[PDB]
Design a protein around this nucleic acid. Structure first.
Ligand SMILES: Nc1ncnc2c1ncn2[C@H]1C[C@H](O)[C@@H](COP(=O)(O)OP(=O)(O)OP(=O)(O)O)O1
Ligand SMILES: [Ca+2]
Ligand SMILES: [Ca+2]
Ligand SMILES: [Ca+2]
Ligand SMILES: [Ca+2]
Length: 903
DNA sequence: TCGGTAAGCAGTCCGCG
DNA sequence: GCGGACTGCTTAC
C-alpha cells in the first residue's frame, strides 16, 4: 500500500511524524528537516523557480528550520520579500507525500473517551484537578472495544464492582439498558486505588496511542482534567506521557470567575466532537449537552438518574458506570449518522494538513494552493500585514410585505465559486482595471462594455481569459466533489418520498428490505417491488434512505462551505492571498447578476403573459429570485386544474421548458457583456409554492428581508408526498425562541398557508387557553451568555446590562451558599424566564444553564413567580402579530356589526 | 505563531409639559 | 408608555 501520515509536529529543528508504512504498520520518525525558502533574483540568473507573477526566484536551502525562520526576520528588516511556505510542517508533508494521498481509515487509531469525577464542592475544575478520576471509558476504533477503568475505592465512597449483567437489563427491570450491540465489546477493569487506575491507563495509552482523539467536550474537560490530575499525583513528566513525543503546551485563558486551560498534546490530533458538530452540522442548538444532542440526532431518551451527579457514584455506582459507557457510545452513534470524522479525514488528507486544521478554512486553502503551485515549480508569496477594512457584500431586495399565493423560486448554483470560475479571479490572473460606471448602468445594460480583451467584474477589475488561475483551478476540483455528493443526497431524498408514498398502502406480508443503493434514483423495477412491500420493510428502507441522505448532506454542505470559505478568505487579512480587489470582484458581480436576471425575468414574463410593466419578481437575496406565479395560473385559469399536483406539474413544466431557457439566454448575454472566460451562471428552479387547490390557504407570505414562509410541494425536483413548510428567518427558526412556542408558531403558519384565517383563529384560541399548562422549560427563551463579568456590579446589573445577563446575575444571587447548584458558564447558553413584580429574587427575570432543570432549591419559586403574561406576549403574540399583519389576516376575530346578533 | 457581508428583532437608555 | 439611537444576538445568504 502507499504510505500516508497520521500526525506531524514541528519541535525546534525537528519534524516528528507518525505515519503508516508500505506494510500498513504504524511507525514514528524524527526528521531534521531542511526547509527551503525563496528570494527574488535578477533575470540574468537561470532558475527553475518562479513566483506566481512569473518573476524569477533563487532557492535558499537551510541547514535547519530555525535558520530559515531567522532569515525571514533579516529579510523583513532589510525590506525584501521572503517567499515560500513558512509553516514548515506543510512543506514537510508536501515533500514526503508528493502524490494524491490514499488513506486507509482502518489503520488509523480513533479514540473516543470520557471520564467521571465525583465532586462534593461544585464543578471539578480541570486546572485544579483536586478530585479523584473515578471512571474512564475509552473506545478504540482498531480494537472495536470499550475499555472501562472503574475506581472502586475513593475518599468519596467505597463501591462494589459494576455488573455487566444488570447493565444489559431493561431499565424497567432495574437495569441500565446498555445497548446489546456493545455488551460483548466491553472490557471491564476495576481498581482498588486511583494511582493504579491512572498508571494502567497511561500504559494502555502507550500501547494504543490515539491518532484522532475525540469525545464530547474532551478539549475543555476530559483532556485537561486527566493531564492535570496525573500531573498533581505523579508529576508533570508523567503527565507528558499522554504525548507520544512527550511534549505538551498549556494554554491558560483565565477570565474571570475561574482559570480554565487547554492542553496541546503534540503528536495527537484532537477533534472534540462538540467542535466538529458545531462546524459541520449546520444547526444552532439551544443546548449542547450530550443528552440534548443525542435526543435531537438519534431520538434516544435522556439518561435518567435520581439525585445530583455528585451523589450518583455513592448511591448508584452501577448506573454511574453504565452511563459513562453509554455516553461514549452515543458520540459514536452520532458519528455513524453524521460522518464528521470521515469528513475530517477526507479533507485533511486532500489538503495535506494536520487533521485538526480542518477547523481552519485559511490553513486548508493555504495548503491546497501551496501544493498546487509547488507542482508547477511556482513559489508562493510571503504573507503580509493588512488593516481590517469593511467591504460590500450581496444585494437583497426589499419585498412588499404581503401574502403571496403562488410562488416559484430560482437560485444560482454555487454562486461565489461559479463567479470565481466564470470571471477567472485569482491573485495571478489580474490583467488590470477599467473605469467603472454606476452598478445600475451594468444591470440595465447601458454602461460601456468594460473590455473586449479581458474578463471583467463590475467592480472595475479585469482578468486574463487565456490562462489558468490557481484559485479557479482548485476551487473547481472541490466544487466537482460537492456536486457529486449533492447528487447522491437528492437521489436519496427522492427515493425517500417514493417510500413515503408506498407507506400509504403497505402489504400484509413477511418480506425483507430491498438490497439497493439509495444514492441513485430507484429503477422502475425497484419501484414495482416497493409497492408490494410490508410496512416493516418499507420503514426500514426509509430509515436507510434517510441515513444515505444525511451522509450525502454532510459530504456536500461542508464542501460547499469550504469553497464559499475561499471566496470569503480573499477578504480575511490573515489569508496569504487577501485582496479586496478579488473579494469585491466576486460580491459586486453577484449584485449585478441578481439584479440583471430580475430585469430579464420581469421582461420575459410580461412578454409571454401579453402585458407590460408588471412586477413578477417579488423578492431576491444574493443569488435567488422569488417569482409570483399568480398571473401564470390565472392566464390558464385555476378551474382548469384537476388537483394540486396538476398545477404543480404545470408550473414545474413552465419553469423548466420556458423560464429556464430565458434565464439561460439572459445570463449568456451578461457573460458576453463582461467578456467572461466561461458561462457558469446556472439558475435552476428551486421551490414551487402555493395553497392546496380548493382551500382557503394563503400559500405564502413575506414580512420583510430574510423573513418569509412558503407552502412547498416541490423542492429542487423532489416532489413531496406531503407539502413542506419552507420558513426562513421567522421565530420558528431561531434557537432563542421557546421550544413550545416554535411549535405553536409553526402550526399557526401551517394553518395560514394551507387552511386560512378561520383555522388560524381556532388554533390561536386553543393555545392561549392552554399556554399556562406548558412545562416551564418548553416556554423558556434561550440566549448565549457573553461577557457576564462586564455587567456584574456586586452581584447586581451594571449600566446597559442585557436582559439575559440580568437573569444570570439574579440566578447567581439565588444560589449563593448552594454547593450543588450548577454555575452558568461564560459563552454558553441559558434558559431565560421573566418574573412578576414583587418576586423574592428581587429582579424582573432569571436565567440558568440551558438543557437543564433549574436547581430544586429555587425551582418552586421560579414556577410560582414566572410571568406567563409577559412570556406569551413577547415570544408568541408579538411575532404572530408580525406574521398576520404582513399577511393581512387576523389571529383573533375582530369586532363587527355582526356582534349584535346571536350566532 | 494562532487566522465573508446583509439584515432583522429584543432590549437599554433617553426624550418627553 | 412609545420612537430613536445604540448594543447584542442570531439568521440568511
Ligand atoms: N456559510 C457561508 N459562508 C460564506 N459565504 C456564504 C455562506 N452561505 C452563503 N454564502 C454566499 C456564497 C454563496 O455562493 C452565496 C449564495 O448562497 P447559497 O445559495 O446558500 O449557496 P451556493 O449558491 O454557494 O450553493 P447552492 O448551489 O447550494 O445554491 O452566498
Ligand atoms: Ca458524565
Ligand atoms: Ca445558490
Ligand atoms: Ca403496497
Ligand atoms: Ca440562494
Amino acid at each position: 500500500m502507499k504510505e500516508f501520515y497520521l500526525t506531524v509536529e514541528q519541535i525546534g529543528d525537528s519534524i516528528f511524524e507518525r505515519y503508516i508504512d508500505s506494510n500498513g504498520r504504524e511507525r514514528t520518525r524524527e526528521v531534521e528537516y531542511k526547509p527551503s525558502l525563496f528570494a527574488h533574483c535578477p533575470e540574468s540568473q537561470a532558475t527553475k523557480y518562479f513566483d506566481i507573477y512569473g518573476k524569477p526566484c533563487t532557492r535558499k536551502l537551510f541547514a535547519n528550520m530555525r535558520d530559515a525562520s531567522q532569515w525571514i526576520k533579516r529579510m523583513e528588516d532589510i525590506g525584501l520579500e521572503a517567499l515560500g511556505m513558512d509553516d514548515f510542517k506543510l512543506a514537510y508533508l508536501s515533500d514526503t507525500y508528493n502524490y494524491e494521498i490514499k488513506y486507509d481509515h482502518t489503520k488509523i487509531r480513533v479514540a473516543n473517551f470520557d471520564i467521571e469525577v465525583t465532586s462534593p464542592d461544585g464543578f471539578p475544575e480541570p486546572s485544579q484537578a483536586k478530585h479523584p478520576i473515578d471512571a474512564i471509558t475509552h473506545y478504540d476504533s482498531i480494537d472495536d472495544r470499550f475499555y472501562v477503568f472503574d475506581l472502586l475505592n475513593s475518599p468519596y465512597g467505597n463501591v462494589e464492582e459494576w455488573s455487566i449483567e444488570i447493565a444489559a437489563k431493561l431499565q424497567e427491570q432495574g437495569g441500565d439498558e446498555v445497548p446489546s450491540e456493545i455488551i460483548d465489546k466491553i472490557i471491564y477493569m476495576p481498581f482498588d486505588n486511583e494511582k493504579e487506575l491512572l498508571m494502567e491507563y497511561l500504559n494502555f495509552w502507550q500501547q494504543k496511542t490515539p491518532v484522532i482523539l475525540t469525545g464530547w467536550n474532551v478539549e475543555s474537560f476530559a483532556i485537561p482534567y486527566v493531564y492535570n490530575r496525573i500531573k498533581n499525583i505523579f508529576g508533570e513528566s508523567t503527565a507528558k506521557r499522554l504525548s507520544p513525543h512527550r511534549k505538551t503546551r498549556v494554554k491558560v485563558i483565565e477570565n474571570m470567575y475561574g482559570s480554565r486551560e487547554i492542553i496541546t498534546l503534540f503528536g495527537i490530533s484532537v477533534l472534540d466532537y462538540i467542535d466538529l458538530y458545531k462546524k459541520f452540522s449546520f444547526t444552532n442548538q439551544p443546548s449542547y449537552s450530550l443528552d440534548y444532542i443525542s435526543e435531537f440526532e438519534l431520538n434516544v431518551g435522556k439518561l435518567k438518574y435520581d439525585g445530583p451527579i455528585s451523589k450518583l457514584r455513592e448511591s448508584n455506582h452501577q448506573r454511574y458506570i453504565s452511563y459513562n459507557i453509554i455516553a461514549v457510545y452515543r458520540v459514536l452513534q452520532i458519528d455513524a449518522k453524521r460522518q464528521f470524522i470521515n469528513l475530517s479525514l477526507d479533507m485533511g488528507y486532500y489538503a495535506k494538513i494536520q487533521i485538526q486544521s480542518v477547523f481552519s478554512p485559511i490553513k486548508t486553502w493555504d495548503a491546497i494552493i501551496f501544493n498546487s503551485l509547488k507542482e508547477q515549480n511556482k513559489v508562493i508569496p510571503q504573507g503580509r500585514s493588512h488593516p481590517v477594512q469593511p467591504y460590500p457584500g450581496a444585494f437583497v431586495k426589499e419585498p412588499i410585505p404581503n401574502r403571496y399565493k403562488y410562488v416559484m423560486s430560482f437560485d444560482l448554483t454555487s454562486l461565489y465559486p461559479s463567479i470565481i470560475r466564470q470571471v477567472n479571479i485569482s491573485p495571478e490572473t489580474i490583467a488590470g482595471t477599467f473605469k467603472v460606471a454606476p452598478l445600475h448602468d451594468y444591470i440595465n445594460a447601458v454602461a460601456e462594455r468594460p473590455s473586449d480583451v479581458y474578463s471583467c467584474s463590475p467592480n472595475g477589475m479585469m482578468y486574463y481569459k487565456d490562462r489558468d488561475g490557481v484559485v479557479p483551478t482548485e476551487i473547481t476540483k472541490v466544487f466537482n466533489q460537492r456536486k457529486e455528493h449533492k447528487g447522491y443526497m437528492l437521489a436519496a431524498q427522492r427515493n425517500g418520498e417514493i417510500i413515503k408514498e408506498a407507506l400509504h398502502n403497505p402489504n400484509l406480508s413477511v418480506d425483507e428490505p430491498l438490497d439497493v443503493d439509495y444514492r441513485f434514483d430507484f429503477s422502475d423495477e425497484i419501484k414495482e417491488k416497493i409497492k408490494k412491500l410490508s410496512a416493516k420493510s418499507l420503514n426500514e428502507m426509509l430509515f436507510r434512505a434517510q441515513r444515505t441522505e444525511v451522509a450525502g448532506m454532510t459530504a456536500q454542505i461542508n464542501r460547499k462551505a469550504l469553497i464559499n470559505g475561499l471566496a470569503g478568505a480573499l477578504g480575511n487579512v490573515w489569508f496569504r492571498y487577501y485582496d479586496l480587489r478579488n473579494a469585491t470582484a466576486i460580491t459586486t458581480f453577484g449584485q449585478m447578476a441578481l439584479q440583471w436576471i430580475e430585469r430579464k425575468v420581469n421582461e420575459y414574463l410580461n412578454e409571454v403573459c401579453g402585458t407590460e410593466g408588471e412586477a413578477f419578481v417579488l423578492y431576491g437575496d444574493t443569488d435567488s429570485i422569488y417569482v409570483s406565479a399568480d398571473k401564470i395560473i390565472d392566464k390558464v385559469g385555476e378551474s382548469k386544474f384537476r388537483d394540486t399536483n396538476h398545477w404543480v406539474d404545470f408550473l414545474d413544466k413552465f419553469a423548466r421548458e420556458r423560464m429556464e431557457p430565458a434565464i439561460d439566454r439572459g445570463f449568456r448575454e451578461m457573460c458576453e457583456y463582461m467578456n467572461n472566460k466561461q458561462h457558469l451562471m446556472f439558475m435552476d428552479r428551486e421551490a414551487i409554492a402555493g395553497p392546496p387547490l380548493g382551500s382557503k390557504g394563503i400559500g405564502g407570505f413575506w414580512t420583510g428581508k430574510k423573513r418569509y414562509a412558503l407552502n412547498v410541494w416541490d423542492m429542487e425536483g423532489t416532489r413531496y408526498a406531503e407539502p413542506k413548510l419552507k420558513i426562513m428567518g421567522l421565530e420558528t427558526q431561531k434557537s432563542s425562541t421557546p421550544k413550545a412556542v416554535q411549535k405553536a408558531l409553526k402550526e399557526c403558519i401551517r394553518r395560514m398557508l394551507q387552511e386560512g384565517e378561520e383555522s388560524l383563529q381556532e388554533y390561536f384560541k386553543e393555545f392561549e387557553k392552554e399556554f399556562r399548562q406548558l412545562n416551564y422549560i418548553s416556554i423558556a427563551s434561550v440566549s448565549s451568555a457573553n461577557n457576564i463579568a462586564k455587567y456584574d456590579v456586586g452581584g447586581f446589573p451594571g449600566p446597559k446590562c442585557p436582559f439575559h445577563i440580568r437573569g444570570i446575575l439574579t440566578y447567581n444571587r439565588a444560589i449563593k451558599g448552594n454547593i450543588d447548584a450548577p454555575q452558568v458558564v461564560e459563552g454558553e447558553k441559558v434558559y431565560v424566564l421573566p418574573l412578576r413584580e414583587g418576586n423574592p429574587f428581587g429582579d424582573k427575570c432569571i436565567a440558568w444553564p440551558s438543557g437543564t432543570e433549574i436547581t430544586d432549591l429555587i425551582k418552586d419559586d421560579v414556577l410560582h413567580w414566572m410571568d406567563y403574561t409577559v412570556l406569551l406576549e413577547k415570544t408568541f403574540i408579538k411575532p404572530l402579530e408580525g406574521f398576520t399583519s404582513a399577511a393581512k389576516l387576523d389571529y383573533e376575530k375582530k369586532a363587527s356589526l355582526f356582534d349584535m346578533f346571536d350566532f
